[PDB]
Subunit: 60 residues, 2 copies
């Protein structure tokens, strides 16, 4: 009566669409309520750390 | 010959399992290669910002 190929796609595509829409909209809404200090520090603390002598030549 | 209720579950459950396993193991492996400076700063820059007078009473 009905194809077994569409019965599986509808289940996964519909389940994936609902989960992606909910979880996607749930996390996408947190980016607007979050601060940009973790991004300004995300790339800053990643490989941009300060490394200078504060007391090696003038201090023993 | 076969139930249309299981044909959908197998598609979504199998697709969700493969996507969750791959994406899950893909992100879970990044936590071990990532630094804890974004977590030490995640809760530090969240609501733990410094606010003290550096020049208000002794400076005009």
């Amino acid at each position: 009566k009905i194809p077994s190929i569409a019965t599986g796609l509808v289940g996964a595509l519909l389940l994936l669409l609902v989960v992606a829409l909910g979880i996607g909209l749930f996390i996408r809404r947190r980016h607007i309520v979050r601060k940009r200090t973790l991004r300004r520090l995300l790339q800053e603390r990643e490989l941009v750390e300060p490394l200078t002598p504060s007391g090696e030549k003038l201090w023993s």
